[PDB]
From a paper:
Bacteriophage T5, a representative member of the T5-like family of siphophages, serves as an excellent model for studying the assembly, infection, cell wall perforation, and DNA ejection mechanisms of this phage family. In this study, we used cryo-electron microscopy (cryo-EM) to determine the structures of mature T5 (a laboratory-adapted, fiberless T5 mutant) and urea-treated empty T5 (lacking the tip complex) at near-atomic resolutions. The T5 head comprises 775 copies of MCP gp8, arranged into 11 pentons and 120 hexons, forming an icosahedral shell with a triangle number (T) of 13. The T5 tail, which comprises 40 trimeric rings of the TTP and a distal tip complex, is connected to a unique five-fold vertex of the head by the connector complex.
The T5 tail tube comprises 40 stacked trimeric rings of TTP pb6, which form a right-handed helix with an axial rise of approximately 40 Å and a twist of approximately 39° for two adjacent rings. The lumen of the tube is filled with TMP pb2. Each pb6 monomer contains three domains, two of these domains, pb6D1 and pb6D2, constitute the backbone of the tail tube, whereas the third is a protruding Ig-like domain. We only built an atomic model for pb6D1 and pb6D2 from residues 3 to 378, which contain a β-barrel structure, including three α-helices and two long loops. However, the atomic model of the Ig-like domain of pb6 could not be built in our structure due to its flexibility. Comparisons of the backbone of our TTP pb6 with those from X-ray crystallography and from the previously reported T5 tip complex reveal high levels of identity, with the exception of the long loop. TTPs that form stacked hexameric rings exhibit common structural features across most myophages and siphophages, while the trimeric ring is unique to T5 and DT57C. Despite the symmetry differences between the T5 TTP pb6 and other tubes, the pb6D1 and pb6D2 domains of the three pb6 monomers exhibit a pseudo-six-fold symmetric ring. The three pb6 monomers within the ring interact through the central β-barrel structure, with only long loops of one ring extending underneath to interact with the adjacent ring. Structural comparisons of the first, middle, and last rings of the TTP pb6 reveal that only the long loop exhibits slight conformational changes, indicating that TTPs may not play any direct role in infection, which is consistent with a previous structural study on TTP pb6.
Author numbering:
A (entry chain C), B (entry chain A), C (entry chain B): 3 to 377
The structure:
Amino acid sequence: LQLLRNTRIFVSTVKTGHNKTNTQEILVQDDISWGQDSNSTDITVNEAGPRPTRGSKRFNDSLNAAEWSFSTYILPYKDKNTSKQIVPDYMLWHALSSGRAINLEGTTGAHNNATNFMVNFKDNSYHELAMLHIYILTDKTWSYIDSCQINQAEVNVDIEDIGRVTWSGNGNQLIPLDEQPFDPDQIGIDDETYMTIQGSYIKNKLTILKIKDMDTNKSYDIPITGGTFTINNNITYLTPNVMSRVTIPIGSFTGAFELTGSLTAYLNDKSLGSMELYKDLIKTLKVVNRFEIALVLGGEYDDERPAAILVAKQAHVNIPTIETDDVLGTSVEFKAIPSDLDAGDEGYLGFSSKYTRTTINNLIVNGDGATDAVT
Amino acid sequence: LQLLRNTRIFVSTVKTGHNKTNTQEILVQDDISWGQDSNSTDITVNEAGPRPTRGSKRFNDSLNAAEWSFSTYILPYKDKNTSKQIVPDYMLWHALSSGRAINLEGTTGAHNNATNFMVNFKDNSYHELAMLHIYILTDKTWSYIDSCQINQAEVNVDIEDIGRVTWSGNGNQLIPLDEQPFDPDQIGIDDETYMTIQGSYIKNKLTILKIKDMDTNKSYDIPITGGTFTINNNITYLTPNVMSRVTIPIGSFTGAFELTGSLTAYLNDKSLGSMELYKDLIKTLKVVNRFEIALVLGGEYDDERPAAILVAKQAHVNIPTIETDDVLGTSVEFKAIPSDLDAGDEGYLGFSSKYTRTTINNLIVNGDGATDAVT
Amino acid sequence: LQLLRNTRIFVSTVKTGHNKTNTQEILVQDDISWGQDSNSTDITVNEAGPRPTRGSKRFNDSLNAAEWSFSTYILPYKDKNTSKQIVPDYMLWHALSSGRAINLEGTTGAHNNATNFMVNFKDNSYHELAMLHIYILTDKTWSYIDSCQINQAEVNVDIEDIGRVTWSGNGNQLIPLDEQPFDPDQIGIDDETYMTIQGSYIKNKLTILKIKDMDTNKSYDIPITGGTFTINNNITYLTPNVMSRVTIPIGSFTGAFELTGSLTAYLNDKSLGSMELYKDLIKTLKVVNRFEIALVLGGEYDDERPAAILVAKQAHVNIPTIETDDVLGTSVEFKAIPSDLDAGDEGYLGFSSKYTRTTINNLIVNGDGATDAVT
């Protein structure tokens, strides 16, 4: 028998070669779900005779796209090889953010500094976004999915649980493989790295919102009681239709990048509170809203603390809806809107093991934690 | 913070002026739900190029109709000012039943007497039925919904709970207001009224059904084990479509009055029992059924007891369906059908704190508790 | 009052005459659900006037098909009158499998020997498959459903509960019959038969799968951890449309015979295991798969044990899907495909109180439990 407790998920770019730089291990939770489905057509005969021909041949006409959704953690840890903080699943973020292949240093989709690891969507303008091969250890069978381009990355601010993203991706085909592709233990998570990983956890009870109105330069102090965040590169797979053969999908195309999320907060009648935001949105009706929303999973402490900051420079905010709990709270929905519909300006993510108030403010102002005017 | 325990819902007829006659307080339960939604259109670009333009501007194009649904009680209490028994939410019943403004004495939609308060739908043939403004205390903020026209009033005979109606209405717009419209303490429920309110409760375990066949003059003795009742003035809101502005709904129109309900009873094989009704409906198939259905929430006692009587002079009754519980019970559905499709003859509700058998018979036969032949 | 504990369901072939040969009693569980519904059209008026005509006459225009679904057991017991083992509900299986009336001895849909009772689907080429009248004793009322042709029979291998089938059929009409059609106690289950019934139970924890690949002559050792099986004679009832009358359905027609099921098993990496089947199905993509699936509700023992064998000579098997439980298991779906779309070769069922390994192999190889080559 094979146990789910022993499952390992490895992410790689090339089929043949396999070293620690090109592929690593993902510290998946017990939410893994993969598989493939087929489109089957049933042929039935319906003729008006005295003796009907009751039968139905079934034909497999095409294959769908292989689907996988594992739920790893948010673990920004310092890299021993080069003093630049890297999350264990940086390649998944890169495949989400850019089509160019693994340019860690050069400012692109997956750019990391000594201080901060940060994810830009400026280069997210390609079809077939950074094909990645994912190897899954169903105990000891080594089954992988070929050419996985990821579809969704969802952060859920559970307000009472550790930071965890839930990836989703549409692979071309799921291939079992009799033999091992590479060496598991050497490639996957060493103990020395695992120590920093265990030290880099994010609580999500220290999340603080920084909603600001670009129209009026008004900043709101909102205590988040829960929220949701999702990135959805809408991938639709093109499958040729051959009548007498079983066809696998070819190509993946793309859709509309949707950096979207939801934010829930309690109703406070103080100044620059949640109720003031509700009144501002309900009283003034605007076709387009311009908000700067900063989701900092960690706190903004005058100390080195792990955090997974999020920013959306301009984000349309829907009308808040009053939710009647024991203590009333409003849930706002926000969808990042790129500028000029060409450049990637929806937002960017920042992961690092050490975040301070100054560095968080730096990333909020400009892309990295380099400088900030600060009066 | 703002708590749901302190919520108060005030129903008013006029905006500026505010006295005890024009508006009162509704003793709502903890099922309040109000809010507004907006229709947002997302613009995406899908062109066949080497570099796709992955972006999506989002626009707010129109506003929907504000939705509110609180669940108050059925509390017919005698009025100190005039000796006519009035429910605390009488003008809500009036807005359900008529468009003319609060003609309490004159026989219309909300007609009251010393003996009975009754709700007639004879004048329920207007568009824009009796606009009412509803003020909501989310703790202390005084946010209201402008020009609420109620949509549904549902009575649920739970058999084990106090009589409670669950209103629903589609308001034009939700306006927060910084300041108080009126004085909450003087306008809403005084202690002297509250005493009679506590004294006028309806148990719902004393309900008795009085189904009679107008075709065959056959009366059935049915012990109700549960049931449902709903009045639905279908309201669809007309919103202008302006491309470059956010439009709020103008006007409300009106649809088909639907006094509908469901009744469940155990299967008794006695004479004039539920099984006899089932056999009568299943054996004889008629295009139109004519039944007189009377739902008396209180009991018919030789004494003064509170009750919330319903009568439907002619009501089409669907075919009963056998529900296989531990003890088998049939569920019948009935929808009151008006005569001539012009006058309001679907039915009428009778609320009062003191009902006797004679008064219940009076209201079942004729409109009020004046006289009945009984020879 | 009437209790569900006393409900008895009798299955009969003829209306007037009633003996033990024509009808018996079905040992139904507490899942009985019968009833009838009607198609009602509501007429509403929507005209643009200052005074809308708010009203809605409701008309009953037609009747649907009466629906019933009881859940009896799988109880193959030896018949005292003739030494041929017969299940208590053999008429239901006969109506499922054939249109010709009760040829128990010879070769048809319900063909039984001294060894095995069997359900053959070769003769399911008729509309209006073997009309049966089912009498339901809701305590003491004796109401039946007229001309019931069954639509579905489902076997659920719960892996921890006794074998039980869940019939479903669309009867023409539900008729009360205040008087008794026949004598209940004499017709239904005597104590002597009930003893063998208590002796004939099937545990379902001894089920064995015998998937074999007709293409490659490869046999898989698969331990079932659960599964499903269903036979679905798609019955669509033709109801005439008369405007001014209530019409009951006339005729029943028939659809495509669908012997379908599902199989769930744990992932074993042994030889000829579930993992081998998964690899064979996922690595090789074929338009049509030809599998011989033999699902025995009982076990194969070198002794006389009750069992309910099932076989599908040609069964298309869909692509297995990995289910991520604590121990990973794959769920395969299989739909029997008849040969030439004219003869009934989807499969056949075998019920008997005594199966040995030799008799099970007999029924798997050829139709009867007579001989098999074995050398």
